[PDB]
Paper text:
Aminoacyl-[name] synthetases (aaRS), ubiquitous enzymes that are essential for protein translation, are considered attractive therapeutic targets in a number of infectious diseases, including malaria, tuberculosis and cryptosporidiosis. KRS1-mediated synthesis of lysyl [name] occurs in two distinct steps. In the first step, lysine and ATP are combined to form a lysyl-5′-AMP intermediate with the concomitant release of pyrophosphate. In the second step of the reaction, the lysyl-5′-AMP intermediate is conjugated to the 3′ of the cognate [name].
Given that the ATP-binding pockets of the KRS1 enzymes of T. cruzi and [name] only differ by four amino acids, we synthesized a T. cruzi/[name] hybrid enzyme (TcCpKRS1) by mutating the four variable amino acids in the CpKRS1 enzyme to the corresponding T. cruzi residues (I290L, A309S, M310V and I538L). This hybrid enzyme readily crystallized in the presence of lysine, with the resulting crystals then soaked in the presence of DMU371 or DMU759. TcCpKRS crystals soaked with DMU759 did not produce a liganded structure, however, those soaked with DMU371 diffracted to 1.6Å revealing TcCpKRS bound to inhibitor. DMU371 was bound within the ATP-binding pocket of the enzyme, with the quinazoline ring of the inhibitor in space usually occupied by the adenine ring of ATP, forming π-π stacking interactions with F307 (equivalent to F317 in TcKRS1) and R523 (equivalent to R536 in TcKRS1). The cyclopentyl moiety of DMU371 occupies a position similar to that adopted by the furan ring of ATP, in a pocket created by the lysine substrate S309 (equivalent to S319 in TcKRS1) and surrounding amino acids and lined by three water molecules. Based on our TcCpKRS1 liganded structure, mutation of S309 to leucine is likely to hinder the binding of DMU371 in a relatively minor way. In contrast, this mutation would likely cause a greater clash with the larger cyclohexyl group of DMU759, explaining the enhanced resistance seen with this analog compared to DMU371. As expected, both DMU371 and DMU759 proved to be potent inhibitors of TcKRS1 activity in this assay with mean IC50 values of 185 nM (95% confidence interval, 98–352 nM, n=7) and 15 nM (95% confidence interval, 5–43 nM, n=4), respectively. Future studies will focus on further developing the series to increase metabolic stability whilst retaining potency facilitated by our high-resolution liganded structure. This structure revealed a number of pockets close to the current inhibitor binding site that could be exploited to improve ligand binding. H-bond interactions formed by the amino-quinazoline are well characterized thanks to our protein-ligand structure confirming the pyrimidine ring portion of this series will be difficult to replace, but this can be balanced by exploration of other 6,6 ring systems.
Numbering used by the authors:
A (entry chain A): 45 to 189, 194 to 544
B (entry chain B): 45 to 189, 196 to 545
The structure:
Amino acid sequence: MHYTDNRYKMMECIKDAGRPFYPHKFKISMSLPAYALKYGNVENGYIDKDTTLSLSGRVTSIRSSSSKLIFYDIFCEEQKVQIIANIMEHDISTGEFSVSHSEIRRGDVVGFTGFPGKSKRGELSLFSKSVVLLSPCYHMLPTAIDQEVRYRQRYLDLMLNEESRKVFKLRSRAIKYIRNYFDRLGFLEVETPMLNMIYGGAAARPFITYHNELETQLYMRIAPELYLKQLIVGGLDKVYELGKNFRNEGIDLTHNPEFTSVEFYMAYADYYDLMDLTEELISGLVLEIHGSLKIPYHPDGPEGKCIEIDFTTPWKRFSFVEEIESGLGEKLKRPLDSQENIDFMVEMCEKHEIELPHPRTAAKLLDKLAGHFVETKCTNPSFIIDHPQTMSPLAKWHREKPEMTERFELFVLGKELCNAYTELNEPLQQRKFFEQQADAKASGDVEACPIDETFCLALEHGLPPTGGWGLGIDRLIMFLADKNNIKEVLLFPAMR
Amino acid sequence: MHYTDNRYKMMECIKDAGRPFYPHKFKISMSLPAYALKYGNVENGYIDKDTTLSLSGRVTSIRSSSSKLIFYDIFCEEQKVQIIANIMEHDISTGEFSVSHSEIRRGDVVGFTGFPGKSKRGELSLFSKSVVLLSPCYHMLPTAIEVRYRQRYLDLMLNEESRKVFKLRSRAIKYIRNYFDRLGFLEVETPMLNMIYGGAAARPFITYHNELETQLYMRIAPELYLKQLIVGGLDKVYELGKNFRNEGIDLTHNPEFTSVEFYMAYADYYDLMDLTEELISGLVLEIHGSLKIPYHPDGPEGKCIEIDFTTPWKRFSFVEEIESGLGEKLKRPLDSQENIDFMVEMCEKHEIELPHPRTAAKLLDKLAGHFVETKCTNPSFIIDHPQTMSPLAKWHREKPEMTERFELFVLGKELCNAYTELNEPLQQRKFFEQQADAKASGDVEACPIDETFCLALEHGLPPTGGWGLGIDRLIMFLADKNNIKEVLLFPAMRN
Ligand SMILES: Cc1nc(N)c2c(F)c(F)c(NC3CCCC3)c(F)c2n1
Ligand SMILES: Cc1nc(N)c2c(F)c(F)c(NC3CCCC3)c(F)c2n1
Ligand SMILES: N[C@@H](CCCC[NH3+])C(=O)O
Ligand SMILES: N[C@@H](CCCC[NH3+])C(=O)O
């Protein structure tokens, strides 16, 4: 408290004494990484008194070793440089040496000018002639990392923690890799609305807002799917979209209210093609980052066990209904959306201590059974395939299997990474399934979507046979970076 | 008329007869562009009966020239191919020829199999043996182009110029990311859902997170989060994404738009002007091959002007240019009641519509809009905005009451807003207080105080330059469109 108040006072004094107060521009000669590249291999004790250079960074250390000599460490752009300030080299036009230095504190952003080289002891250094206080720190900084501070004051985390800074660099590398993959395949990158008069395209509860001048509610998108498929009607053939989607839902280690996904739509692909592309893309990215397809993961955090996740392709397929039936020891009732099957599935939830959905739709019940019996088998990347139509309103009926669709989900360690299907392109059925969804919504299903007449009209203009797909990039980055909490891979995660 | 209902009946009949009904997969041999590249300069009348290929596209034309011969055009991936369906080549296992072809209509997505080559008249063709109805069109299509915006797929299907716009849009965005990537910037993502909105003069959307029992705002800008990353030591960050406004819609405003903002440690606004020129002139040159480009300010039926991106671009000093327009000086201080009253008098004198409330900032903005933005045809910087209208901009190092800020205007439309960032927490808190006071007096564009940001500044924001570009508006100039609805796939439309 006192430190902060006092620093404010000290800065007002500087201001009133006509001393440098928040200089507008400090011209660096080079970055600290550049400085290190240039001078890092000079001989011990090397100094170039013929070269004057300006540097800047945040002060991480101050040591006055004598009345004549002050050592600083400064850090910038992942590089530390030592500053050696000797009273005999001080430019007195900037002030008396003791006055100039007395203004600086650990944590301040400062500039220095001097001669480059290396101390006798071998430390990369600048032998300074001046110091400029650029931006003071008004708080006594913790020397290294409630741990909610890391998320509510992420700048402190970034200032102190190299590991955290590497995660956000990895994130960008992964996103660039994904855009590059689609770009090179001839996909067009597009942007479709995040504000929708009618939400759709996922099993999700939306955020609701209002546009005053247009006099309408708008929803924040839960997915770009319905717009993207209109682009395939439009003849663009191969589109993708990489950006934010939203969920008005609870938060946990794998769920934030906004997340980054990539979805693509490819004319003439079916879900078998999509499985192959998924394997290719994700195994590629894993290899790019890790140099093989078998990678470490710490499911319980860095002090817990280390397992190995094996991305060798092809991946296991589990058939949705068959794996539930294997778990139950008996068959689901047919049709799967009958009252007989609903009742059987409720009975099985009691028998197996599975928490019921609300409302008890056939789709929701199927999902809870899959959660318990099938997603739990998905340790290494595994596809869960052939989802019932009743839970898959936008997925095309299976060419072989009654009541099923051409759908998959990718799971890694029981977490959903992808959702994809041969797209439903038949408008009569699509409208019927939308009606069923609106019915479910009306019955209290907060994840069911309203009918979208604009989409049905688009289907009436002819959607080519198409395959579509989505990937939760944050969740993938958790595996790539070895983090078990979504808050580690988002700069500013949601907090209760 | 009954065309849609009839098509539904046709499809039901097909389904009930066991005939092909929405096949799941059609395996093409090659794309239509690849087909054209391979066979496009065979000899007239060339046919290779030894090669059977499968091709697919949308039917753009049908001519049943006789009982025995039907000509189709199909279109896919920017390439048209002619199909010649002769009864003598028809595979009867797929049905009788008349039955098979009776199912096809203009606009349908179809597949064909057949032999490659060229008609006697020299048209690249497939000599087909079968046809598969993949996805019917239930509507009679216009032969050529509000419908373009409400049913964008029709525009895309029929209008090459519309497809070109969205390709150019992607090229431009890729160019931008590349520009910052090569300079060593880190691309980041910061929250679109904010507990406390800020960083622009704008009314936000408001929503609610049920589980966390909290009101949220949709962002109007990323600026306050981005600056925290520079406090964090990331040094160079950029963010290219959507921002939101709960405001009116017009030819240059949609309720969501795409902007890029960057934050560069150690830059001032002079550095940012230089970067602006280099990025934008470079992108213009890339797309147009000149720095002088055509524009149709009143649409394609109006006149054509030239916009000149040659550097150095014009600078106008905000207050000096107002005073040149007035033929008299503003009162000082600029935020005094005396100057507010004087600016109201000047608005009345010059028939400038008054803002509400009549704050010093709003009045200055109205004056600039009348006297200064109207001078900005070619790319021009308006510089050195008053502090009272610039709560996040650092005080001018020379000019009392001003800041180190610029806006870029093209044809009087705002493209960029940028400044030497305020990094001094005492003043920053005071300016936020003034904004909250404006809000309380009725200013629907003023933002509430963000304590979290002020506390970040107390940890030491290096001297920094920050900047934002409205990408859509830039694309309007690059693609020569005067309506924002032309450069967004799915623009907002009145009910
Ligand atoms: C961090 C985070 N938060 C959420 N809330 C998510 C979500 F709800 C999801 F449905 C979700 N599914 C993926 C499969 C296809 C689209 C993306 C996610 F990857 C989520 N990722
Ligand atoms: C299509 C569209 N619609 C809007 N509503 C815009 C807006 F409000 C704006 F403030 C705005 N300023 C730009 C200058 C810096 C940030 C972006 C725009 F470029 C907008 N572009
Ligand atoms: N929109 C889906 C992903 C794409 C599914 C296939 N079209 C989701 O949000 O889960
Ligand atoms: N956030 C500003 C652009 C950045 C200005 C400089 N920090 C805007 O929305 O106008």
